[PDB]
């Protein structure tokens, strides 16, 4: 009592001030750019949209009892906003309810009252044209609730709030949508609600209702509005199609919807990974290991987001199976030190000839390997065991014999020599010619990359690239 | 005092790690145990050693007596504040922190060394104090915190010499350099062995030359390293003294391909018995092998390993699997042959290479402008 | 020792001389410009980071 009593004057007021004012400015400028700013497709409250991405995940989770955030919802949701007098009245209420939080007791809203709080926006000449404003007003019912990470008996109330918000999709698709371009904001809202509603269906069974509804909400894309909704809903579509053990993947390849364009270096980067594992499940053959490296190098700016460890883990797994033999200690993050040990032993016995050591490690750490979702690694890794050795010696000796190259790679028999001399030609793992009159696999080499038109091949795309950059500058300059 | 204080940290840093090899290390480590009044380091070696003749009672009275000989003035001095003058007198820790390191542990040494470092604002004292922090950084092998005071010396402490970093600018090749770094301070940082020997701890005239000779031959192959290893005069005298150093060099330059393994095996025997354990060698032994493979493979595109069976050494199969180890590891650029017994080589052209690099840099910077393109403008 | 532009053949007992083409200059001077372009993109980098 004397210890815990003196320690709650300061905790409440911080969210009471900044958690108060942040979305106040957000809804403010965002509203002014909803009425004005006919080109509000790129709002600076979209960077405030990102600021809300990392804003509530760390700022506030509970409603901050001792009357800090509990009174926010009864204030912020009581928004009638009829005209300038009845809106300057609410402008008064922004400060007027502050005496209610500070002096009085706030309105307790433990994720049960926000649903009945959805009448304050209807009271006193409700506003429906501000479906962005009431849309963030539909995110806020989740914002303390879902971000509290409960998944306990209010998952269903999550679902009901998101049913009202899907009714806000109904309002956009049906109610006063005169080219207001709000779906592309409602597609981000659909994103946020369906990350933690994705988790909601992780804490419960399958999502097939959101599969058909996802094919509908995605169906409306490409016809009237298409920007990041097809992207995000496509990724949510892919994640649990992959998560479930079924065919599930050639349906994705035939899912010819792959080009929702530039995703601001965030959605597109992971997008290459969602598609990347997809191309990986069909025995990827250096075509999508390049896009694995691409995705890993596109948006790494975070700090171990949690799936980034899985892209960093699974990336060179396929390359090991294909041609390469690098380890994965290069980015030995503290975030990686505990996610490296099984894979650490994993890549050693591949290049080393101790396949019994490889089976020892595989039986040793297969549980982690099976937790990684890479069951099919062993069924095709013995492939690149002898292919890795033969790639090594094939690189080493230029005019190597096949009648000698076998006997060094623990082949032990001339018949065993040429079981690898039947597909290496068609594969291209080594460039040589095999003969029976001379059973010697002699390779060769060529030049004229500088004497054949290699450079002007490599240059054209990047020339277009730089002119692209110039076009972006000229298009994104003269705002003032 | 602290000037011969080197050897204790070195032999203690050499003793316990070699388990099979510690007999002489204890035979003289006892000489470093009670003798020299040595108190601080070995008590922390209580669980680090297995046997120890009784030195608790024989020596704790010795650190206690001298500790009583220093702490009585180091904390209350009041020697020159009886008539008038400034409010202090500089006689306390500048004259009594040295025992606070030699017998005072690293803590009582550090608190007084910094306290006098701030007490006397002069680079004159900032010389000896900070360099005691460095030699103690070698003492307790705490080679991370004393990585700080070095650059901290470089910022303000260092300004070009001034009898304080020029006379001791050889506080900067042996004192604080690669114990385990093994990077571009080997060929470049370890070249200007200017003085015959600089005094505090770096022994050019005896064994720093062993450092800079074990490290000289890493810089270049033949853009005239022979002028500074072979035409060098002061190095010519030290090589005149040490034949193993002299033969190992004169082996290397004078196409001594068969004895490269002999002298090389000698110096690797040296690396066996050393203080640098983890950096036993990253690139010494067979980076000198492959170093002999640059000049050996040089100009001999139509080379045969049969000639390798006597010219550079023997064991055609061992040279075989070695070149397999090197060509397959992106090193030793050439194409070696099966039964023909031919050692072929082929480097790129004047355009294949630069194309191969420009394609790299263009991809790097293009990826950069990718991210920075979308950082702004939403 | 670069006193000579030739090549020796152990399996041939043959020396062969060639000519020295110095045509690496443009590719040489191209890369260092990239070396500056990296750091200048840094200069814009901490610019946009310091303020959008």
């Amino acid at each position: 009592p004397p210890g815990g009593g003196e320690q709650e004057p300061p905790p409440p007021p911080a969210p009471q001030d900044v958690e108060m004012k942040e979305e106040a400015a957000t809804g403010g400028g965002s509203t002014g750019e909803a009425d004005g700013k006919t080109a509000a497709a790129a709002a600076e409250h979209s960077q405030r949209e990102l600021d809300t991405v990392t804003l509530e995940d760390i700022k506030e989770h509970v409603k901050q009892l001792e009357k800090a955030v509990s009174g926010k919802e009864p204030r912020f949701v009581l928004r009638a906003l009829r005209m300038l007098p009845s809106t300057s009245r609410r402008l008064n209420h922004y400060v007027l309810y502050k005496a209610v939080q500070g002096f009085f007791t706030s309105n307790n809203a433990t994720r049960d009252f926000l649903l009945p709080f959805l009448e304050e926006p209807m009271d006193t000449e409700a506003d429906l044209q501000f479906r962005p404003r009431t849309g963030k007003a539909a995110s806020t019912p989740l914002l303390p609730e879902v971000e509290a990470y409960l998944q306990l008996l209010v998952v269903i109330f999550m679902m009901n709030s998101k049913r009202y918000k899907e009714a806000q999709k109904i309002s956009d698709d049906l109610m006063q949508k005169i080219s207001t371009q709000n779906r592309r904001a409602l597609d981000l809202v659909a994103a946020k609600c369906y990350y933690y509603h994705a988790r909601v269906y992780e804490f419960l069974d399958k999502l097939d209702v959101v599969r058909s509804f996802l094919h509908a909400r995605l169906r409306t894309a490409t016809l009237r509005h298409d920007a990041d909704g097809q992207a995000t809903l496509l990724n949510l579509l892919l994640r649990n199609y992959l998560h479930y053990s079924l065919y599930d993947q050639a349906e994705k390849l035939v899912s010819k919807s792959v080009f929702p364009e530039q995703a601001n270096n965030n959605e597109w980067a992971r997008y290459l990974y969602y598609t990347g594992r997809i191309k990986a499940i069909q025995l990827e053959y250096s075509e999508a290991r390049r896009t694995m490296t691409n995705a890993l190098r596109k948006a790494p700016q975070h700090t171990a987001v949690g799936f980034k460890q899985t892209v960093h883990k699974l990336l060179i797994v396929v390359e090991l199976l294909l041609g390469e033999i690098p380890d994965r200690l290069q980015f030995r993050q503290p975030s990686l030190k505990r996610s490296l040990m099984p894979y650490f032993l994993l890549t050693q016995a591949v290049r080393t000839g101790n396949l019994a050591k490889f089976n020892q490690v595989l039986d040793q750490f297969g549980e982690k390997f099976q937790a990684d979702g890479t069951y099919t690694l062993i069924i095709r890794l013995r492939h690149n065991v002898i292919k890795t050795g033969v790639r090594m010696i094939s690189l080493s000796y230029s005019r190597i014999s096949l009648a000698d190259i076998a006997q060094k790679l623990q082949l032990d028999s001339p018949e065993d020599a040429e079981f690898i001399v039947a597909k290496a030609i068609r594969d291209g793992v080594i460039e040589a010619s095999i003969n029976h009159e001379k059973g010697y696999v002699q390779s060769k080499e060529m030049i004229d990359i500088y004497s054949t038109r290699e450079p002007q091949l490599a240059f054209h795309q990047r020339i277009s690239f730089c002119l692209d950059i110039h076009n972006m500058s000229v298009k994104a300059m003269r705002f003032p | 005092p602290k000037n011969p204080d080197l050897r204790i940290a070195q032999l203690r840093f050499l003793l316990s790690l070699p388990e099979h090899r510690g007999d002489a290390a204890v035979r003289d480590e006892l000489m470093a145990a009670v003798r020299d009044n040595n108190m601080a380091p070995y008590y922390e070696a209580l669980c680090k050693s297995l046997d120890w003749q009784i030195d608790v009672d024989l020596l704790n009275k010795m650190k206690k007596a001298n500790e009583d000989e220093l702490k009585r003035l180091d904390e209350e001095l009041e020697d020159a504040e009886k008539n008038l003058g400034e409010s202090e007198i500089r006689d306390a820790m500048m004259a009594k922190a040295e025992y606070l390191c030699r017998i005072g542990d690293k803590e009582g040494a550090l608190t007084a060394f910094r306290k006098t470092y701030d007490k006397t604002v002069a680079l004159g004292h900032r010389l000896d104090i900070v360099f005691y922090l460095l030699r103690i950084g070698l003492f307790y092998m705490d080679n991370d915190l004393i990585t700080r005071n070095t650059e901290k010396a470089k910022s303000l402490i260092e300004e070009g010499g001034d009898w304080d970093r020029r006379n001791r600018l050889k506080v900067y090749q042996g004192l604080y350099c690669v114990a385990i770094r093994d990077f571009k301070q080997a060929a470049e940082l370890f070249l200007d062995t200017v003085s015959t020997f600089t005094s505090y701890e770096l022994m050019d005239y005896k064994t720093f030359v062993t450092y800079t000779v074990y490290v000289s031959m890493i810089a270049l192959e033949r853009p005239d390293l022979r002028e500074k290893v072979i035409k060098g005069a002061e190095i010519l005298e030290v090589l005149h003294s040490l034949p193993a150093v002299r033969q190992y060099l004169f082996s290397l330059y004078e196409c001594r391909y068969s004895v490269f393994f002999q002298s090389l095996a000698v110096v690797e025997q040296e690396m066996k018995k050393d203080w640098l354990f983890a950096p036993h060698y990253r690139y010494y032994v067979r980076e000198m092998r492959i170093h002999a493979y640059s000049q050996l493979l040089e100009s001999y595109r139509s080379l045969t390993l049969g000639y390798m069976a006597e010219a550079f050494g023997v064991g055609v199969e061992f040279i075989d699997q070695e070149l397999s180890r090197f060509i397959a590891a992106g090193r030793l650029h050439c194409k070696i042959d099966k039964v023909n017994e031919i050692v072929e080589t082929n480097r790129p052209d004047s355009k294949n290479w630069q194309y191969q690099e420009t394609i790299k840099k263009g991809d790097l910077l293009l990826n950069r402008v990718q991210k920075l393109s979308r950082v702004i403008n939403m | 020792d670069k006193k000579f532009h030739g090549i020796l053949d152990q399996g041939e007992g043959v020396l062969i001389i060639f000519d020295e083409p110095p045509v690496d200059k443009t590719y040489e001077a191209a890369l260092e410009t990239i070396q500056n372009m990296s750091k200048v993109v840094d200069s814009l980098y901490n610019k946009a980071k310091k303020l959008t």
């Binding site: 730089c466 002119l467 110039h470 972006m472 | 402008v369 393109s373 702004i376 | 372009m37 303020l51 959008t52």
Partner: peptide, 30 residues
């Protein structure tokens, strides 16, 4: 290729240059 390379970056400077002045003068204007 190199010329286009530097030209793109030079064009990219003005994006930061004007995107700074626009919003910084706006937020101070309001």
């Amino acid at each position: 290729y190199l010329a286009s390379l530097i030209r793109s970056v030079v064009a990219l400077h003005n994006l930061i240059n004007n995107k700074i002045a626009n919003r910084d003068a706006e937020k101070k204007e309001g």
